[PDB]
Amino acid sequence: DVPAPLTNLQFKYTKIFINNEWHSSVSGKKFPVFNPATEEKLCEVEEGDKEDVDKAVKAARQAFQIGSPWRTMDASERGRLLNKLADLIERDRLLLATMEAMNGGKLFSNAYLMDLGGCIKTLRYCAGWADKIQGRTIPMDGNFFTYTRSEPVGVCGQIIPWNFPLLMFLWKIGPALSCGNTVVVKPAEQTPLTALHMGSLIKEAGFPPGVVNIVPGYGPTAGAAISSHMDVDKVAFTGSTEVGKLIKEAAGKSNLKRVSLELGGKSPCIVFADADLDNAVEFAHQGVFYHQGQCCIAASRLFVEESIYDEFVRRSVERAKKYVLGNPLTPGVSQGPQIDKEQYEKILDLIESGKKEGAKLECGGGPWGNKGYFIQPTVFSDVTDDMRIAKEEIFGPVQQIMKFKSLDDVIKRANNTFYGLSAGIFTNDIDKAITVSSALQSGTVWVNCYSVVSAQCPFGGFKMSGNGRELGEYGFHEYTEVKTVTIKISQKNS
Amino acid sequence: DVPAPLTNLQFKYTKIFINNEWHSSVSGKKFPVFNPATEEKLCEVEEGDKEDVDKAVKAARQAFQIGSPWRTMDASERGRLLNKLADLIERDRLLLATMEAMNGGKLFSNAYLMDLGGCIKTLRYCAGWADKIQGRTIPMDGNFFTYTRSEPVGVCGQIIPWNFPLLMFLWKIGPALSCGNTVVVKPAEQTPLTALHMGSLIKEAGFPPGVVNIVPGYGPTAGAAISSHMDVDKVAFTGSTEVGKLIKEAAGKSNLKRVSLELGGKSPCIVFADADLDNAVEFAHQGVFYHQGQCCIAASRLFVEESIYDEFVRRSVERAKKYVLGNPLTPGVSQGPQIDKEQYEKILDLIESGKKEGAKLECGGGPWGNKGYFIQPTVFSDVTDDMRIAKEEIFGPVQQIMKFKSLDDVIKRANNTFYGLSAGIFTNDIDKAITVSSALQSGTVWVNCYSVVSAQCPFGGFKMSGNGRELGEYGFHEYTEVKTVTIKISQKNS
Amino acid sequence: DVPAPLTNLQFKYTKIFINNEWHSSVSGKKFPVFNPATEEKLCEVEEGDKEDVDKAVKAARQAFQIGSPWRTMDASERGRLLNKLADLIERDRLLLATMEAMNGGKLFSNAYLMDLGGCIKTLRYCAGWADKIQGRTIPMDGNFFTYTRSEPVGVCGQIIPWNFPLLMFLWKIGPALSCGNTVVVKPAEQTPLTALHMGSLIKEAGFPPGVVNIVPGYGPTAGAAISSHMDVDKVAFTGSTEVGKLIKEAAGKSNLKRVSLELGGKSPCIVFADADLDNAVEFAHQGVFYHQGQCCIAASRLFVEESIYDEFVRRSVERAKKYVLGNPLTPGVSQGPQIDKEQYEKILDLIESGKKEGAKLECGGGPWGNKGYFIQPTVFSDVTDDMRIAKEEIFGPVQQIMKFKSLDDVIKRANNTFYGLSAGIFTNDIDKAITVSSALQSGTVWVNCYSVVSAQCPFGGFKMSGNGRELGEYGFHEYTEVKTVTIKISQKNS
Amino acid sequence: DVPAPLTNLQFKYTKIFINNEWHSSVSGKKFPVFNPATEEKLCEVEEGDKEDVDKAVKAARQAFQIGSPWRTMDASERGRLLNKLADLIERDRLLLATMEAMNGGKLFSNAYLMDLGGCIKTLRYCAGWADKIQGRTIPMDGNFFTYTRSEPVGVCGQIIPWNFPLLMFLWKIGPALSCGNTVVVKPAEQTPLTALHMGSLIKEAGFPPGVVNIVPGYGPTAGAAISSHMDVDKVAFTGSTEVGKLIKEAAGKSNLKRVSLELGGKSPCIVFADADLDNAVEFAHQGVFYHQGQCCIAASRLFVEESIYDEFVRRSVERAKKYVLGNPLTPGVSQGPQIDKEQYEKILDLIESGKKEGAKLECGGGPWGNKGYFIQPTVFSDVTDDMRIAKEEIFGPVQQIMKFKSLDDVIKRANNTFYGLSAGIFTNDIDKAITVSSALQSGTVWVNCYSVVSAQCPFGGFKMSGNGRELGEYGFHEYTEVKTVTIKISQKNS
Numbered sequence A, B, C, D: 001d002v003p004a005p006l007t008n009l010q011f012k013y014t015k016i017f018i019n020n021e022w023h024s025s026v027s028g029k030k031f032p033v034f035n036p037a038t039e040e041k042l043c044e045v046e047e048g049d050k051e052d053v054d055k056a057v058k059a060a061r062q063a064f065q066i067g068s069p070w071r072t073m074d075a076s077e078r079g080r081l082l083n084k085l086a087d088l089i090e091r092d093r094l095l096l097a098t099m100e101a102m103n104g105g106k107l108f109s110n111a112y113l114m115d116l117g118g119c120i121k122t123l124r125y126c127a128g129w130a131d132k133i134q135g136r137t138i139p140m141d142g143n144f145f146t147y148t149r150s151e152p153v154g155v156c157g158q159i160i161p162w163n164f165p166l167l168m169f170l171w172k173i174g175p176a177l178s179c180g181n182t183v184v185v186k187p188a189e190q191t192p193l194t195a196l197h198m199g200s201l202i203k204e205a206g207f208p209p210g211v212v213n214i215v216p217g218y219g220p221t222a223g224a225a226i227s228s229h230m231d232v233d234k235v236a237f238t239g240s241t242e243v244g245k246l247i248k249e250a251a252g253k254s255n256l257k258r259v260s261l262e263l264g265g266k267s268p269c270i271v272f273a274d275a276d277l278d279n280a281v282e283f284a285h286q287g288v289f290y291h292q293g294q295c296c297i298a299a300s301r302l303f304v305e306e307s308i309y310d311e312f313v314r315r316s317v318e319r320a321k322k323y324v325l326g327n328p329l330t331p332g333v334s335q336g337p338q339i340d341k342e343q344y345e346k347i348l349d350l351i352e353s354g355k356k357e358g359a360k361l362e363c364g365g366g367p368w369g370n371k372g373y374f375i376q377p378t379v380f381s382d383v384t385d386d387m388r389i390a391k392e393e394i395f396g397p398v399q400q401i402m403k404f405k406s407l408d409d410v411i412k413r414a415n416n417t418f419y420g421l422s423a424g425i426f427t428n429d430i431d432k433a434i435t436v437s438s439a440l441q442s443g444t445v446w447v448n449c450y451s452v453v454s455a456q457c458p459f460g461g462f463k464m465s466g467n468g469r470e471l472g473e474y475g476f477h478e479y480t481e482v483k484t485v486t487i488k489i490s491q492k493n494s
């Protein structure tokens, strides 16, 4: 069941979280946080900047010192702590989901069922890895005993976006902590509030001070202080390709910190004429429209084989007209607002470009309401590869439908992008399913489905969609630093 | 046995290698290659620059296309080809070792036994991995069949230094090819010649054209074209920390290419009073003086416990006086020249700083001879942490000896550097061996030995000594890109 | 803190557990269960035999059918269930520990702290593996896509002993269930009661009917019905070497079921003259005397280097005189009874053989009290290799101390047994620690400690001490059956 | 190209091979070895029995001692030796293929291309694993450093059949030697000769004496001495299910040696109405008729969906009539003899049972020729589940074709056997491919192909088709024994 959301939320956690204590910003500045459905201020939060980040990094470094409680505790106890944290998220699920919906413009039933469910599941999966991260014993040449230690990397700076604020917060801290790292988290300026609530739960669960620090504030201030910091070992970032470039450059200029990036996409969804059409229409539809289009994996180039194209367009348009826009806390609302004015204007501008460049506007194409950042769900057909709406990540409720005839051509077109996050293929042909998935330059390839993301699966981009993977076995190994130890012995035996 | 070296070598491979053919530079320019022991010109080599790199990257890209011979080939056949390459190195061992000694200022016996032995071993280890790089099947939530592919990354730019030219060439191409990548290699301008001879063996072994391309030339021209190229998927670099910063920055500013770096060090070697002194003196001595000090892992901060410090200094000084400097092809010579004038002047300047800053000059401390870049083997004692010779990588035959009293202090001092490549510990105490090795922020930690490097071990730096690991199981996972494929099914079963 | 135990326990779960329901035996027979400290009857339990086992195996088979709730549920949900079961064990910890102490003759504080703690920890570790058991994707020759599935093996018969009844019950069901198997458990006739209580918790936690079935009763009846059953896929057994032989033969004669055995030992503990003696005395002492000697790993051959032998004997004898025998529920009692009359007589007979064969009786050597199976802690010195007490597993509070002079000789003597479960080495010498541990033919080798067993470590025997490993990563892989699936495709790419 | 076979082979290796020397049998007895196509004696070979096995096991044990050349050798050197062995097989390919064809009744082109090709590939794959078999470092609870060693198991007895004599020899020794074991091999009495030639190549390649020992002779004499030996650590066996039962029983009764078995099959091949029929007919046909039906994986229950059954039968019968029987060295012959009289009579008897039990004889059904054990290729249709030819492994050129209507029923029928080695599915449906392959209780499941076996894949049976897997990563883990070493330390850090 989905309970009724709370209303009249009273805010409590508005400060910078360092060493399990709440701090005012060093400057004393605060910044306002808004509800994108109503444009009203929810509260004000302490504005972290470089001086706040430096305090947080000193805390994280101290907590990582050899002999500290976090370095010496059993790996199994790191697991127990993560599970305790998941129990507290379950206890606080209704508050968190309400908060996430209010601050994120996110449909409440989705926040409650999907986001919060994924948050719990992600932590449970992470908890289970803690005492199963292992090194090796290695049959090296000569009279030596050699082993490796899978150590934590150290102090990990973690910068996250506004589209799945709580889920992304846990995607970052879960694996990092499971592996024994300490962290400095920088939530999006738009969406700090669930992250700050999580500070109280981290303390309550019993994590040692300085293992998680949380610095709300802006990007080129707090975020950039993290990327350039000379005592941050690793930075992990989810957001725009443009900012990912700045982060990698900053890492280079400063201390060569390790870098992982998940960056967004222009993911192709390929529907062959032999596909189950009912299934493909719905998955491709949800695949681009989910959370008002504000998903890195959005199926924002829908390639449909010529013989089924007109029918696929007709059904896709029909499907896009079935939404009720409004406050995402209101029962019956099936589409909320975009996050803020910047994203709103970016989308409208891209919609305008589609009209100007000759795409066929099938429905929507304009704003809705007299408050909040609402945009009518929009479908364009007869989209061609050179159009802005075919090239640029829109991050709004805007679907592009394109035709193809040749298998070789559609693979080429699908791969002809600097992005590489995900892709979908719809076919009943075994050979196409395997060979087309092998040929697509995308990190995750769905076959006869879309948007299926689990904690057990590694997730991340090819090309400019990202560096590294998150979650799964592979993700974890990347919050470790490998040390080889080679001991001379009188005589080795096999 | 070590055969007599060749003399009066006739050079043959002096051109840019692309698509298994030999090309003049686009500009027509050539650059001279010298013998550092004699200062005489060995030959001229085509000067590759940006336009040559662009041809090479186009060739590597074409060779990496889906359906190409290199992509479709059995993994086991990639392994066979690598072993065939090692057989050809075996056949050409005397030529390659002679050429390496002449061009690199490297003691011929060492080039023949160690460098070329390591080249062969590295390739044999790589060849064995080719058909053992596997993905996973994953028991993800819901009715899906999910698996991963460990795909090659793609086109890999590989930039290498002058100290172990051939060995570094094969450390790069071996793992990359084992995993199915295609490569563009940029040898150091000082030492292109053994790499160019390898082009002929790569063609002879039967690698498809475009799988290995080799562009000799300079750093800020050919190297920088690779690091900034918009169609190179990954850059791997071994060299100076200064250039590694440029490489990472260039990767960020361009196409977000994956980056691995191995960058040199200021490696501490810690000798406790309970150590076997005979063993420790020799390992520490070789650990800093090997190849005229031109090793990334040089034991360039030797920390010796107070009660044994004077005796260790005395023994280390005695040991450093047993060298015959000269041409490294000449029987009886046990120390060759530094690679070139830049390095020579850098070393002399650091020696001068030691004298100025109050270190105790125990022996050497000046140049030798009237041709070639020779420096007397030099030992400083009473070295303190703030001295230039205690902080900066010297890369010359210059040993620093420092005293300590406290275990906690020597760990702190050992770790108090931006570097983290390697370290050594000498002790008879089991507890110190394990706990001190855990506490040291170094990628490889040797216990009662030093300089022990084998293809089976991962190798690389903590902190600003590097990103990523090379060789071993962990290294090979670095030349792959993980794809997750998730297929909808009617019902899953365990 | 250790709470006071319960007294006046009222028994509830006395029946055969099949399909989450409680059954009377098919014959109607019951068997008595006793307290070994008092010889009083605790209760009667339904006596399972072949006809009961057949019902249980049919239940387990049905629960394992393709499409069943247990085969289709998410692997992550198997994990959640195991953790829920651990939560219930925590809730019921005082009852279970009291029961275990009363039925097992086991010191209550140990039952509460060690056994029950290990039970919880084992389940938490198992839970975390459930959705991390993965297969492979394999770069096979030719145009094929090949993967493997790590399936459960199926119906697993699990026969367990009386010395750690609850812990062994969870060692068996934890990994089996984590991997997706169904099970038929046969607790020791001496000690069914905690296992039956666990049936109620299994039901309460929500495991589907037939996933765990529990058949109390005797060995050659219920146990042998399991080992010979034509529809049991795998049998796992912990107990005597003699019975392990019967189980493996039965598996051969019947349906070739998979077999794993942990079988007991005659584990050597080697103390070199360079060891920390205080540490070695206590670990070797606890290593043989723990739980009245009733541990598979008992350090029942203590080899002490000649120069420290007399002192080690003196201190070991002194240590063995510090026990208070009695009811293991009574505060202050530090040694409980042996499990039953058979074991009691076996021990006394072996003690008698040590006296007859010329070992030096240092202390104990006889029974104590006028009810319950109590034996004075006994130390023999001047033990030689041919003596019964040096060869045969005693499984009582009887320590054998033996001298050695030569390193080569002591390794030979240590290895000169058909057993191979565990061993200990006490030394301050790094080289001995590594090389002696490599040379000993034992499954687990402790260095400067003994009896250290964790869920993260694989555990089992060399030679006649066992087949396979339990727990750790390696243990789990053995509750799986590997299926290779190879699909023809038009063209493979790397 | 296939060269002409040799004729008039002169035999040289006819003795028992122990410690790299050739021994007469202890008894002095010899046994004759025949050509099954001509019934003529090729040569006589020393008849090994229990006393010969005992000499061989003593040699293998000595070679496995700590400090021996085989135990102390670098793992990478074991790999080099294996590759050298494969080089010698390459050199001796024509001799070995000719000898295999003559002794084994095997088509010469197949022996030269397939058997010998597979022999070489297997060894090359094995050689690559040698220095990549690794243990773990484990983050166990408490202040300990814990690691594991993946040790060899020890002395491995290896008993092999007559159908793929050389290939099975190398399937056994390759993985065992790669992992560092020593072996005692017992070739089938029908086919010792290629194995004895391998002894000469093992010595030539440079394997230390006692690492491979080879004892020709009979089963209940030499084989049973191995299975019951008190100093063989592991037995690996390929052959009849009946003998595998004896082997497992003997292991239980003696020393609890580890056991792996591959035992033959009654493998179902399921053709759905939506399959590519041309493809399915040929794969199913080869899948049962290959090597005169003498393959463990024979597709000996062909289930064809009702609507296509008559056409499939017609096409299968047409296909079975295209053979020329005769001497397998003769160009143009496409079917050779069965191995010996026992097999010949067993096949004829099963053919007779098919006729008696009402199966429809479509073609063949009787003997051919006046010398050698030839049977006409035989096809039965309208075969039902209860018939002897539907249940028992025939191991002759006899194809059974059965109809089905329901998916659920054909899975149930396919699984309704004690066997479980392999299966095939032919369909164009993605869902059926994945779900039906998940549901089939078979070790290898082929989709749209059959008989595809590669060194990179694990291979073995479910149920009474086997215990354990051979080859692939999983197989190699089967020739190791895991040791856990746990060292006390002052304080652990992550």
Ligand SMILES: NC(=O)C1CC=CN([C@@H]2O[C@H](COP(=O)(O)OP(=O)(O)OC[C@H]3O[C@@H](n4cnc5c(N)ncnc54)[C@H](O)[C@@H]3O)[C@@H](O)[C@H]2O)C1
Pocket (backbone or CB within 6 Å): D159, D160, D161, D162, D163, D186, D187, D188, D189, D217, D218, D219, D220, D222, D223, D224, D227, D238, D239, D240, D241, D243, D244, D246, D247, D262, D263, D264, D295, D296, D343, D346, D393, D394, D395
């Ligand atoms: N590929 C496959 O799986 C198959 C291959 C061959 C037949 N397969 C099946 O088995 C049947 C009989 O063939 P046989 O020839 O009798 O096999 P055996 O199993 O006897 O012979 C196999 C090996 O075991 C040795 N041996 C025999 N008796 C022994 C004993 N008591 N202790 C120890 N060892 C004994 C024997 O010397 C030979 O070395 C065939 O019709 C096939 O159905 C399947």
Ligand SMILES: [Mg+2]
Pocket (backbone or CB within 6 Å): A240, A243
């Ligand atoms: Mg921005």
Ligand SMILES: [Mg+2]
Pocket (backbone or CB within 6 Å): B219, B240, B243
């Ligand atoms: Mg430079």
Ligand SMILES: [Mg+2]
Pocket (backbone or CB within 6 Å): C240, C243
């Ligand atoms: Mg018994």
Ligand SMILES: [Mg+2]
Pocket (backbone or CB within 6 Å): D219, D240, D243
């Ligand atoms: Mg037989």
